[PDB]
Paper text:
Our results suggested that three conserved residues (D8, T11 and D221 of SePSK) play an important role in SePSK function. To identify the function of these three residues of SePSK, we constructed D8A, [name] and D221A mutants. Using enzymatic activity assays, we found that all of these mutants exhibit much lower activity of ATP hydrolysis after adding D-ribulose than that of wild type, indicating the possibility that these three residues are involved in the catalytic process of phosphorylation D-ribulose and are vital for the function of SePSK. Three conserved residues in SePSK were identified to be essential for this function.
Numbering used by the authors: 2 to 421
The structure:
């Protein structure tokens, strides 16, 4: 089976066509601008650009397609899926009262956030005054897949979560559906399942098989986890990037609105996680990468530095423990740059350690092993510190590209996420 993964991220889009019986693939890219008067046009043209750059052989052989997008990026469209106003991007917050959403979702549901799809739909509602029932709100991944299969008001329970969906009960609340916003809500499927065949005109134009299936997509954050291949509960993917992002697979859904912790449904399992303000950005504040490496070579993890740092890049922390007033803790600062670096890596290690423990304290399945992604994943000293402090096998994630995880999503769905 040959599947195509389309990933639309923060500043670009990547396509990965993958042949899974050959384990061979091709990857193409499109880079977004940093400003547009028409982001829908930018995204749609990116879609055709990605498809075009794929060789004719692969395109003829593609049987399934899936698309992941940025979580919280939504479009207000009419009956035909035509943008009626500018998209509200993932980073944009809305000046609405979250108390106006209380009757549509449970106590501290993930949708209760000024940046959620639901909050943006309510913002649009109070903007236009009254939204027509034949209109629809679409996530980025939704709208793009709509360009492929032509079926309107279709989404997945990953993107739809922050729209107010409850994947624990597999439904929107009856009060939300009965509401004035109800007619704009999409039909929610499981990521990976076939929505419908590709549009005949689209298939013919781009030399794709007319029998190719367009699946239900995901978020790019979840696609990244799917790229690792981890499917057993207790397994976790750690992203050692600018910020440390933890993703833990569990048999139980856990949530903590205080620390921004919530859970996505993933087949029969649950994907929980948390994001710290700490990360490699703190490291770059004192070292360039080259110097960072030359100094890491001289660090022996088997001996404590005596330093107890909390490596925030600035004031404020959100996970594992929430404290907006917490300041970075980088004292005492030794004269030896090597040992100061060790203190930093030890602090970042503690963040990850306390992060996974916090997740387990909330009820998540105990950590079995860790797959690592991001820039710090290649840092073996950092890996040793993480390993000896956490106590589980830690390795580098085989694949990390979101488009590849989405290609796997197209090829196999979420089938691996069940009891064997």
């Amino acid at each position: 089976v040959v599947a195509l993964g389309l990933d639309f991220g923060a500043s670009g889009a990547r396509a990965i066509a993958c042949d899974f019986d050959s384990d061979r693939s091709v990857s193409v890219s499109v880079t977004f601008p940093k400003t547009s008067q028409n982001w829908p046009q930018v995204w749609r043209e990116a879609l055709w650009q990605l498809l075009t750059q794929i060789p004719a052989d692969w395109r003829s052989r593609i049987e399934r397609i899936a698309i992941d997008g940025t979580s919280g990026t939504v479009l207000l469209c009419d009956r035909e899926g035509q943008p009626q106003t500018e998209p509200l991007l993932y980073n944009q917050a809305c000046p609405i009262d979250l108390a106006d959403l209380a009757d549509w979702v449970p106590a501290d549901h993930a949708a209760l956030s000024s940046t959620s799809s639901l909050a943006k739909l309510w913002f649009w509602q109070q903007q236009f005054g009254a939204l027509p029932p034949d209109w629809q709100i679409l996530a980025q991944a939704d709208w793009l897949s709509l360009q492929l299969h032509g079926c309107s008001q279709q989404s997945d329970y990953h993107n739809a979560l922050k729209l107010g969906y409850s994947p624990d009960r597999e439904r929107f609340s009856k009060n939300l559906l009965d509401s004035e916003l109800g007619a704009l809500l999409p039909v929610v499927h499981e990521p990976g399942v076939a929505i419908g065949p590709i549009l005949p005109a689209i298939a013919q134009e781009f030399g794709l098989s007319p029998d190719c299936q367009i699946c239900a997509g995901t978020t790019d954050s979840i696609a990244a986890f799917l790229a690792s291949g981890a499917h057993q509960p207790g397994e976790a993917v750690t992203s050692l990037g600018s910020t440390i992002v933890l993703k833990l697979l569990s048999q139980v859904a856990v949530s903590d609105r205080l620390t921004g912790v919530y859970s996505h449904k993933l087949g029969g399992y649950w994907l929980t996680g948390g994001a710290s303000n700490c990360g490699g950005a703190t490291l770059r504040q004192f070292f360039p990468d080259t110097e960072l490496e030359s100094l890491s070579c001289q660090i022996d993890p088997t001996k404590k530095s005596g330093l107890d740092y909390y490596p925030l890049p600035s004031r404020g922390e959100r996970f594992p423990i929430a404290d907006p007033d917490r300041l970075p803790q980088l004292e005492p600062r030794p004269e030896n740059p090597v040992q100061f670096l060790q203190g930093l890596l030890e602090g970042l290690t503690q963040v990850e350690t306390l992060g996974y423990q916090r997740l387990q304290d909330l009820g998540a399945t105990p950590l079995k092993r860790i797959w690592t992604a991001g820039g710090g994943a290649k840092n073996a000293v950092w890996q040793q510190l993480r390993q000896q402090a956490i106590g589980v096998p830690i390795a580098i994630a085989p694949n990390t590209e979101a488009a590849f995880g989405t290609a796997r999503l197209a090829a196999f769905g979420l089938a691996a996420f069940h009891s064997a």
